[PDB]
Amino acid sequence: TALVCDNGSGLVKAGFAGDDAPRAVFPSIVGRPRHQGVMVGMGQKDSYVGDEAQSKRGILTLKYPIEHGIITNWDDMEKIWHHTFYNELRVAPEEHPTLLTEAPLNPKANREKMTQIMFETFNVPAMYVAIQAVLSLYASGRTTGIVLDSGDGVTHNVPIYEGYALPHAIMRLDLAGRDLTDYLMKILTERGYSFVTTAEREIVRDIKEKLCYVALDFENEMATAASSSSLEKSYELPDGQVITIGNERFRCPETLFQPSFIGMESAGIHETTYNSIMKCDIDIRKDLYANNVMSGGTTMYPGIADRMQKEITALAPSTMKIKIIAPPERKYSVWIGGSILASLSTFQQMWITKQEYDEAGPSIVHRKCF
Amino acid sequence: TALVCDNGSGLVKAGFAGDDAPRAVFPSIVGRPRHQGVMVGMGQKDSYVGDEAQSKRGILTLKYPIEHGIITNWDDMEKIWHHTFYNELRVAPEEHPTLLTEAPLNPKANREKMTQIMFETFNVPAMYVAIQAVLSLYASGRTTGIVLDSGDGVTHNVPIYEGYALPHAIMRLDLAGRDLTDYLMKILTERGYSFVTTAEREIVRDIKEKLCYVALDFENEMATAASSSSLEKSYELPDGQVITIGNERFRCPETLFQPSFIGMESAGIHETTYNSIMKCDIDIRKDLYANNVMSGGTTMYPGIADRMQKEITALAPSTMKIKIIAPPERKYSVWIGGSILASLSTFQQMWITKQEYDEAGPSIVHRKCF
């Protein structure tokens, strides 16, 4: 059986090929205790991962081994991969060919180190690295469209037409769910609340996951919030005290449409999606506007597809029909696409094998994958 | 029955002898993908032909195997002929004689390789190569006239009197609809619009086919457009953005009357027609003037027959009636007249046969097809 691992910046999602959803979905996190631990002999250990590290977040310090879709700590990454195979999937990796996911426009050394760890340390039969946008198109069941994926660390656009990607029209924005968590954690200070610890980052992420939404007209939501309490909602901290959140609840996600809120110069997700369509050839643009496929957890806000349709309708010429394709399974449409691709009968000659990694070395991944 | 295949420079026109019109009509194009084919399976092909290339064109480099009436790429021309027989007509070519066509004053080797591929690749039982302007005269119901035929790659004049061609008076001009399309790209660039790719060359060919027309007096039309909105009108691109054009609508076709617009040193199509009549013997000229026959898609402009009659009336002496015959079906007159010829009973003795090719090689065409 083949494994599929969607190696996300904020969540790991993992499973077998042909399963309709991941078997495992957990924080892409490693942690160490920050206190004396003087009551020894209750089963303590030097480091923790995933849901265990998340459940003890008060006494831990939490680190993500991935930053902006780049592995920043390779020891912590192999500790997470060991935990995927032995703790979560509960299988031997040397019996399972493994599909992996990556963002486009990544460092070449990231894909190579991800390759040599798989063959040298997990002894895998065969491996493949897929650009995570085309997997979102496989889950959508279509040959053509512009994929927008926004995960934890990165947002990116990939135009595909009739199975061909346009790699010059591909573009990435280093702004997604982590940066929106940092900005929510900043603007809650305007109401007098404080969040600074790595546990408090996760409390603000756990708020962002459920209170926040995208405004359909930001100045109107600001003006109505400046004249009524009806947009305010409330949440309880693990410590038991209660907080109330108002225009902060849409000013956070608005950063995707106004990146200048976090001091970035770059274009918003509507403007970058339109500019990626305009960077494509004149005949394909009609079928890209008809197929804006949304993907990844930062695309899960209420109202974001309606806002995206409003905005791309203002940028495009008025004669033609624009639609946003935003399934309920948005968070998993990458992994679901990997499940489909790893199950295709024609894909079984595309796996990069140990028996060709042997003579070529780690540079095999660049010549064989993409 | 026999196939008639008017494999012209821009459109293949094909069908059966005795049919009212061609039942296969498609771009004389092979398209090949110019981008990264990332999705496995997806119904992808190594190359595409005709309407399949024209509909996929946003991801394809498009090229015509035939330029100025000469086959430049025989591997893609076999690909086009295969598409005519097996995909577009749905016939065994080994069961049917084929009437082929070419322009006069072509290279000898074009006729030879064309007969060789028909007998050795397509295994045809019999074939013939007709001069395109001689075919167009049967479609007129005439046995004397001068035929001005202009396709995509070549314009030619052939004078015929009482079924005798005057081969010394035949004129060729390597200027027709593809040169007019290239010139329309060059002048659209002056109003604000750049068309550059082989795919964008098909958009501006479609603009030319429904916006452009021939002015009766170019300097009056040029002054009328320079001083009013009334000659200006618009077109919508695949991308839904709108192109407005004015004097470009009649400046493009005027290149047939003024070849110096594209840097050529030649007489226009009117004066080339008159020079062909004036190369004929003095007694036949009266009946050639009364029988100027228009043919091919580059004669389909509004006003071109009225202009051609005005221009030839200024060159000829006023003592006689100039008549321009421009049928509404002149888009297909070469094919129509090929279907007449291929259905005549004396023509059944004029075919090159398989047995006769096998005994003589491809040189048999030069001593049987004139």
Next chain:
Amino acid sequence: TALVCDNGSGLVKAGFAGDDAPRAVFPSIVGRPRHQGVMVGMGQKDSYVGDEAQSKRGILTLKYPIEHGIITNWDDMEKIWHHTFYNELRVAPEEHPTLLTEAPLNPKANREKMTQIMFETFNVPAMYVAIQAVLSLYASGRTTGIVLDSGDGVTHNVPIYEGYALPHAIMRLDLAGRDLTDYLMKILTERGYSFVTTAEREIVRDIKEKLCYVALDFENEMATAASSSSLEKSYELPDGQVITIGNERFRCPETLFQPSFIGMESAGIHETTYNSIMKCDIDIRKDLYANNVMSGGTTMYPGIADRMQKEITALAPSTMKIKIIAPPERKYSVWIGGSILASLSTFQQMWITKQEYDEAGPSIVHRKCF
């Protein structure tokens, strides 16, 4: 005296007629602040120009008002011309006639608005709009040649013989210095160096102008760089941190010879030059192959003339000398040619005067300039 102002897509180059080199050479940039600007008395202003924008680039967003040799923002362009005359040259336009520059195959509304702004806003006595590449041939000391000109926004070929240009054989390519900068930002990401802001686009341009070079044998340099060696080299960013690059130094300008690296369907600069020579009349081709002239700063990569000579030698027939002319001053040769043309004692009938602009309006420029 006459002013000469080369309106480059990347740098303004300006001076008086008869001077040996430009007096003013500065970025064709307007910059605006992108932050709150809280400090009173800081000397902040609403917008910045040229080297004043470039030296403030950390706090600004930087806009080039010329894209592909076309003014896209006229309000910021008249701000650039105001800075040129009143701050950089320090003269009154009301006293000096002005020679301006434009690329061939360019929207004629650009030339109209450009002449209108000089007579309406600057009240200039007289002016002209020379073709960019025709000036470079005066600076070359010649009257026969094909000029390959490549600036920041556009690359073009003008063939000219005995002082006559062949406008049907003029060719234009919308690929030059910025397209190579943007491709360098794209491929710098393969090392993990991220450059995304308009200020970082200037840092990557400042890298491109000293680290990049043209490979004579690209696929052999790709093989040579795989064995890590003196092919890889270092640069220090404004923050004091350092980057190392290898094959990115020659994949950078290889995009001139392979436009498919940025997804363009077009010939490289070698095949575009050869196609322009082969579009000229057969007798002049020998003298064009011996007089192939390079201009604009995108012709200033080490090894580009040696590689161009190698490529044109492989395309053309072997019997005749092929010579490429690449002066050390070729950065300025268009402005130098303007300094000659405005100085020549037989040019003074060719200026457009304010007196005939007041009769005809800005459409006067099409009667005088080409």
Next chain:
Amino acid sequence: PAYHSSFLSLTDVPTTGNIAMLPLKTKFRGPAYPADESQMDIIDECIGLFRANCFFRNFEIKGPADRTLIYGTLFISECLGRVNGLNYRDAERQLNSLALENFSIPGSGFPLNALYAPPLSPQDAEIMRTYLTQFRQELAYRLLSHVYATEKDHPSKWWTCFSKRRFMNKAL
């Protein structure tokens, strides 16, 4: 006359529609029963007969073994159409891609839908597909050992010439 399958002399052979699921030597996954590695099977027969059989223009079918040999003969003509100008490695990946891609079975664009029976049940169709995919992957892999026998970077012209020898004027 033409050459028929020696495996028409076999009896009680497994069958789908009216294909015979004959014993097969192979390393591909699927339903076919392992043949003896020491003896000719239907693919050693089908490739050994093909370059004689593709010249005949008349063939009488003795049973389901010949219906299997004919489907193989038509698929060797497809392979020799697909293989031209390739390196041996590119040919292995192209002809496996050809073998694996979605094809018509008898009872569906099938060229011989008069001579072959439809699948006998909705489940007989799946065993017919899973047999024919395994068979034609092995048939592709085995052919390449003959067309790249003497040289490895160009297909032998002594096999590429049959690429237009359309058996009985039929093709897949």
